[PDB]
Amino acid sequence: MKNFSIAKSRRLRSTPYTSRIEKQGVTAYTIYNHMLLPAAFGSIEDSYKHLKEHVQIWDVAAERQVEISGKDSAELVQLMTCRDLSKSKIGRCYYCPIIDENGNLVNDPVVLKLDENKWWISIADSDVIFFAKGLASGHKFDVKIVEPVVDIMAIQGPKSFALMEKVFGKKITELKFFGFDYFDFEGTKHLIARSGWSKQGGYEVYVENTQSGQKLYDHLFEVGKEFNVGPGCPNLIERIESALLSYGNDFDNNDNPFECGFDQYVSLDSDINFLGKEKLKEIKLKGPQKKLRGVKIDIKEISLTGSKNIYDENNNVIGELRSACYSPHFQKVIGIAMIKKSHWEASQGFKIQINDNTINGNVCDLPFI
Amino acid sequence: MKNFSIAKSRRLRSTPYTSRIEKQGVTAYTIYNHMLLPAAFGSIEDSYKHLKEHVQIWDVAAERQVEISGKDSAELVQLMTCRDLSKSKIGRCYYCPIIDENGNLVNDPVVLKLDENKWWISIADSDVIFFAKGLASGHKFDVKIVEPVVDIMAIQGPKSFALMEKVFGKKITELKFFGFDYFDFEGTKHLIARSGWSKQGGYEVYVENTQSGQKLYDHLFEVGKEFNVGPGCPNLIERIESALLSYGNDFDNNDNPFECGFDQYVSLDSDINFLGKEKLKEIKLKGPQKKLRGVKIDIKEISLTGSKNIYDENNNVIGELRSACYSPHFQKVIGIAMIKKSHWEASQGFKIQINDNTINGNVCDLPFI
Ligand SMILES: Nc1nc2c(c(=O)[nH]1)N[C@@H](CNc1ccc(C(=O)N[C@@H](CCC(=O)O)C(=O)O)cc1)CN2
Ligand SMILES: Nc1nc2c(c(=O)[nH]1)N[C@@H](CNc1ccc(C(=O)N[C@@H](CCC(=O)O)C(=O)O)cc1)CN2
Ligand code: NA
Ligand code: NA
Missing domain, CATH: 3.30.1360.120 (Probable tRNA modification gtpase trme; domain 1)
Known part of the structure; x- marks a missing residue:
């Protein structure tokens, strides 16, 4: 079928x-x-x-929402994200990368501050509820964590x-x-x-x-x-086109925020503690060796179901195409790729296989429009 | 549609x-x-x-596997489950319900003991890896946690x-x-x-x-x-037919192992350390207010997509049907239902509305065959 x-x-x-x-x-x-x-x-x-x-x-x-309420709820939310929420206000939402002990992405939710002691984490596709439950148990935090209706x-x-x-x-x-x-x-x-x-x-x-x-x-x-x-x-x-990134598609638990364009949300020079702060300082000093970029591919159709390698002029893998589609604006295929630092530059050329032919593409910035 | x-x-x-x-x-x-x-x-x-x-x-x-290795691995694996792994043997697999701070089910994996310091947790449909990572961060456990290939x-x-x-x-x-x-x-x-x-x-x-x-x-x-x-x-x-239970279908994170027939796997009288052990003690002492049971239903077709309420003769909800199918062995529909304490007994009758017919059913023991 x-x-x-x-x-x-x-x-x-x-x-x-x-x-x-x-x-x-x-x-x-x-x-x-x-x-x-x-x-x-x-x-x-x-x-x-x-x-x-x-x-x-x-x-x-x-x-889905992860609701975290109680005494230690603000601190637990802060613990999970590299974004500085110290000046957060009730009635506001905040895009907050959630990271693990390696500094790698777990989820990229929107966090809603309902009260100082009541937070909603509006999640991408991973079970943040169990990350939060594990953290709370190990840290002996006094919080209530539920998936609300x-x-x-x-x-x-x-x-x-x-x-x-x-x-x-x-x-x-x-x-x-x-x-x-x-x-x-x-x-x-x-x-x-x-x-x-x-x-x-x-x-x-x-x-x-x-x-x-x-x-x-x-x-x-x-x-x-x-x-x-x-x-x-x-x-x-x-x-x-909007470069709205999707956990599991464009980035996953093997990527860190600096490889994803999340630099502006990693708060390293404040006094807040969060997971992997650690390693994120180390990563920022050295710089990433791969980063999400846009691509354009001159063909009129694609059905991407998983990663596809993209290749250089010596047929060495230089990245991985992760999301792609035909764009009526450009009248060609566009996509989001994790590319090696050798091939970052907007306008850099690359090669890719679609069906069984080598097709040319070029790297570009995000967003596309 | x-x-x-x-x-x-x-x-x-x-x-x-x-x-x-x-x-x-x-x-x-x-x-x-x-x-x-x-x-x-x-x-x-x-x-x-x-x-x-x-x-x-x-x-x-x-x-998927969650691999947990290193010096504190055995401890972290046991912290997650109510099953006593203290006499576990290399080369053996163990069914190990994973429990949260409320004594409720997170996952029902099979755990393989590769070495004293290397464990694979073969998981049902939830992100156990993040539960593990959360716990490990809070306890500062000396472990490596990965999803292996x-x-x-x-x-x-x-x-x-x-x-x-x-x-x-x-x-x-x-x-x-x-x-x-x-x-x-x-x-x-x-x-x-x-x-x-x-x-x-x-x-x-x-x-x-x-x-x-x-x-x-x-x-x-x-x-x-x-x-x-x-x-x-x-x-x-x-x-x-075999009464094999599935996390997310028959039971979920609002259920405890005493509601699911997992009593034999809950180790409350040994010295092991795991989550919700107090509460499982409290819960075991009151006894469950609802439990999984089998049902048989008199129609030859069903397409179950979510919980369906099951009723008594005077239209009170006495349980929720959670998995069902037509069984060629019974020449009728059978299923697994969370039934209220009032109505567990084998043979108890109930009614279910499927489209334009109210259909009779009854409660039965698991397994069916
Ligand atoms: N509830 C809500 N929850 C979410 C999503 C949502 O869509 N809305 N989407 C998924 C998480 N991903 C995103 C990605 C982008 C945005 C978003 O809207 N981003 C603005 C960020 C604005 C800012 O930085 O303040 C942007 O222009 O990039 C929100 C959630 C899952 N959780
Ligand atoms: N790798 C492996 N991993 C798993 C499953 C599996 O299927 N095999 N299944 C999912 C978890 N659910 C079950 C349910 C039942 C059993 C099972 O096999 N049960 C025996 C229990 C025997 C025992 O307790 O020792 C029985 O007869 O009921 C195993 C995993 C996800 N993880
Ligand atoms: Na939906
Ligand atoms: Na599969």
């Missing part, structure tokens, strides 16, 4: 939105944090054009602002990027952040009152018709 | 066997430890009948013994259940355990020398025609 079906089970968790999206045209799934995440609603290029011009409602429930619905695209203002009024229009607050829908208060995994604008509703969230989802579709609302999901083209 | 395609990416990791199985009729995948695990090679019933009669070779590379291939079914003897000769016939040793294939030594996720007999080859394991895979198909060898995968029907 060309395509393979996904085998559902309790373990591949469904979401509060599954039954809806399956009547709205979902065509493919991925699995993210042991949960169904839509991967396509038909054509990826059509979804991309629609996202950049209208507004979409997304089931991103698979962006939170199921994010995102509203993304340039008409997200107009749609959300229609539903919630003027107060939501004051919400700054990466801020959050609480908004009433039909008597129920929901936490809503201005965030999401696109650079096309919008919001993430952190649904705790599940039935009210399901009704809000339906209401967004009913009153969003004038904005050409449609279902959607994180878009491969958009996210590669 | 009926079946949905899986969307492949680097993050949904492929295995050393992917290219082979995709020429051998794989039709459906699940995701297990962020890795492709085959779910079907066409009809599940036909796969079931074949496994019960003959022999299958399985890609179960998604059964190990990609299990299983050989399962009543003809597995004869096929393996064919390849490896008499000495493999000496291997006892849950034992392992090293066996030469074409000059490469492979760790082989008598284990696997069926009750139909066989082995798991812990392939480290990937190229050699791939050659072995091919060789088993070539020499296994005598035994009607075929490809396959863990089988829903067989595993429910």
Whole structure:
């Protein structure tokens, strides 16, 4: 078979939105944090054009929360990330690389400061919950760690602002990027952040009152018709163009923040303790020997399922292509590659095999646009 | 909406066997430890009948290892589990429930004792590696923790013994259940355990020398025609009939081992140090308020994708059905359910609404067969 079906089970968790999206045209799934995440609603290029011009409602429930509350909750959150949260404020979100004893990436969540003693870690695809539980047990921290009943619905695209203002009024229009607050829908208060995994604008509703969230989802579709609302999901083209990086795809637990472009989030000259601070000082002094870069490849199609080596002019491996797609903007294939320091330079040439032919590419900066 | 395609990416990791199985009729995948695990090679019933009669070779590379080595390794491994490993022997495997600060299940791995200071933890679907790393950081344990390059291939079914003897000769016939040793294939030594996720007999080859394991895979198909060898995968029907439990399906991180039938593996009266030991003591003294039980249901079809409530005659929830299938042995649907203390007794009747029919069922003992 060309395509393979996904085998559902309790373990591949469904979401509060599954039954809806399956009547709205979902065509493919991925699995993210042991949960169904839509991967396509038909054509990826059509979804991309629609996202950049209208507004979409997304089931991103698979962006699970790790809730850490209690006396030592701030310190435990800080312990896991190289980002300095000492001046963090309630009502703000923070992109926080989580690192291990080697200084290597575990996850790249968004952290929400709900209170000094209550934090939500909105995670990429790894079981941060068990990292946090292990750390807390070993450090004898006085915290409570749970995966709360939170199921994010995102509203993304340039008409997200107009749609959300229609539903919630003027107060939501004051919400700054990466801020959050609480908004009433039909008597129920929901936490809503201005965030999401696109650079096309919008919001993430952190649904705790599940039935009210399901009704809000339906209401967004009913009153969003004038904005050409449609279902959607994180878009491969958009996210590669925007260089929105994906744990497990572009970087993994063998990479450190300096190999990923996370330099601005590694706080080494402050007094905070975090895992691997250690080794991260050593890595920053010497400099990385590999780094994520963009590539352009002159061909019109690709289906990347895993890493592909890229090669030099002497057929020595000089990097690894990790994410890729056809970009209508460039009218060629673009992608994200971990490249050796020999071939870093924007415009450096390389060779790659697609099917059984050697095809030329060039290295470029991120983001692409 | 009926079946949905899986969307492949680097993050949904492929295995050393992917290219082979995709020429051998794989039709459906699940995701297990962020890795492709085959779910079907066409009809599940036909796969079931074949496994019960003959022999299958399985890609179960998604059964990842956590390797913990060094001076404090034995201690860290024991810290994670309620099972007493104090008299553990090199060359043996042990079923070892992994427990958190609440006494709840994180994973139900098989632990292989390679040396006093080298342990492999063969895991179910959760990121045990990060639990280990967290604990090790807090305790400042002198350990190395890695996910090694190990990609299990299983050989399962009543003809597995004869096929393996064919390849490896008499000495493999000496291997006892849950034992392992090293066996030469074409000059490469492979760790082989008598284990696997069926009750139909066989082995798991812990392939480290990937190229050699791939050659072995091919060789088993070539020499296994005598035994009607075929490809396959863990089988829903067989595993429910055999009462083999799956983390994330039958039990999860809100359940403790006394709710799951793991009592024999919980060591409370020895001197071992592990997480939640106090709380398991508290919990054992009250007794569980819910437990896993078997059910039989009077219909011939089901497609279970999540928990389904099961009811008494006056419409109160008495439990949650978590895994189910049609069983050709029973000529009816069977399953595994978390049932409330009020309604455990074998033979207790219940009702379940499936679409337009209320269907009768009853509670029963595990295992079924
Ligand atoms: N809830 C929420 N949770 C998340 C994601 C999200 O999407 N929203 N995405 C995954 C984690 N990855 C990212 C990647 C990028 C961003 C993001 O939005 N980044 C801004 C960072 C802004 C900043 O640095 O302050 C950027 O322009 O790069 C957020 C999460 C999983 N967790
Ligand atoms: N490598 C290996 N690793 C594993 C699995 C496996 O399948 N093999 N399976 C997953 C964990 N679950 C199980 C469930 C049952 C068994 C099993 O085999 N149980 C015997 C227990 C025998 C004993 O306790 O000694 C039984 O008959 O119930 C093994 C792993 C993930 N890790
Ligand atoms: Na989701
Ligand atoms: Na696998």
